[PDB]
Amino acid sequence: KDLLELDKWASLWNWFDITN
Amino acid sequence: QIVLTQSPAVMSASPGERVTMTCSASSSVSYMYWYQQKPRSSPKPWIYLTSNLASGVPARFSGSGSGTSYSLTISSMEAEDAATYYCQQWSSIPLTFGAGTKLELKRTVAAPSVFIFPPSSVVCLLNNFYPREAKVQWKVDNALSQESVTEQDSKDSTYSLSSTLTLSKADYEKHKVYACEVTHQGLSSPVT
Amino acid sequence: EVQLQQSGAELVKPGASVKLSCTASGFNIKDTYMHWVKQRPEQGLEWIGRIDPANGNTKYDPKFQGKATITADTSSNTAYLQLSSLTSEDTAVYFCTRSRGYFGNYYFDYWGQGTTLTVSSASTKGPSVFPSSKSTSGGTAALGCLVKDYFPEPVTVSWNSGALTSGVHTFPAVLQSSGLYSLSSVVTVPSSSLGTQTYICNVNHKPSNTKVDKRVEPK
């Protein structure tokens, strides 16, 4: 589960919280 | 493997002045994380996500940077900050740390006082000297051991040295004079 | 209030196996990961690896795999770290922390208390112990004891059980080339108060269960 514990995959998840 | 070369490793600063310490990487990372570890204690997290303080971190601290440029700055330094500030990244695996920068307090220039103990192993003592650099030279009958230095004392920000000259009982009774010579920083001469 | 209860200090033989613990309290480990960090003495931190408590997502540093084995008990809420083929380089202090990934801002929020590990073959060596006109300086006389030839660390040294608080300097121990440890602990007294007020160094070595009270008398 890299997409949740890595740095660069945070700005991506920040866009899921503003588009849900 | 993205590693963190941290600098300045050894530094000194008094209270009131600003302190800035960097932690550059071998490859571009997106965030830097700071951890402070006091002696004989677990590292307390300081700054996360490049420039976000933790719960108990004073607002005088702050981070900044981008890519490999990453640092930590203090608005005005206080006293309870003298420790190591390891950095860390979370952009690539394996996760690597920096070697940490040791933070010391800038005390007034002061030479130590020499003292010698005789075995009834000769023990020499240095007390309350700043800075921490010192040179110890044993001289048994004018002829040229393990050193031990304490941390920066919480009361006066001074260090203390202990050189332990080990010698067998057969060679201890063969000589006569047992001296301990020290060359300090502010003192322009040696002692014995 | 969140805590991580680790294990106690260890002393293993060169090449044997040893396992550490980390009982996490105040939260469920299944809601996060668990990371172990090795810190060589007087050096920096080294990331060992991690384990997902719920299922198999265990990662290690590729330079640390094979040597490290991180397990977990979901019902016990305790993370374990097993090591094998202990060598002199492995002699270090090991910590325990967690990381909630993106939802916890990645940073290691809560750490354990840290566990010290030592590797050698000369085990259970009791400590050996040891004021003149050349020990005084301007109305202040220096005196102390020499705790030598003990293993393993540490050796608590107190003076008169609370007396002579100021001016005490218990130096950190040095690793002699003989294999045993040896430190010093001095204390400063007045001009002629060294012979008047009785001073004694209380050296207690908990591993070997060696409590030694040495009296320092002037020359």
Author numbering:
A (entry chain P): 658 to 677
B (entry chain L): 1 to 120, 130 to 153, 158 to 205
C (entry chain H): 1 to 130, 134 to 222
Quote the study's own text.
Here, using structural analyses, we provide evidence to explain why a vaccine targeting the membrane-proximal external region (MPER) of HIV-1 elicits antibodies with human bnAb-like paratopes paradoxically unable to bind HIV-1.
Despite a nominal 3.5-Å resolution limit, the VL and VH domains of Fab460 including their CDRs are well resolved with the MPER-N unambiguously identified and built into the structure. More importantly, the N-terminal segment of the peptide (D659 to W666), which is largely in a loop conformation ending with a β-turn plays a primary role in the interaction between the MPER-N peptide and Fab460. The C-terminal peptide segment (A667 to N677), on the other hand, is helical and protrudes away from the Fab-binding groove. The N-terminal part interactions include hydrogen bonds, D659MPER to K59H (C” strand) and D664MPER to Y33L (CDR1L) and to W90L N and S91L. The sidechain of E662MPER points into the positively charged pocket to form a salt bridge with R50H positioned immediately proximal to CDR2L. The common epitope for Fabs 460, 2F5 and m66 lies between the gp41 C helix (HR2) and the more distal N-terminal MPER, creating an elbow/hinge between these two segments. Whether gp160 ectodomain tilting facilitates β-turn propensity prior to Fab-arm ligation is currently unknown. Thus, Fab460 access to the MPER is likely restricted, even with gp160 ectodomain tilting.
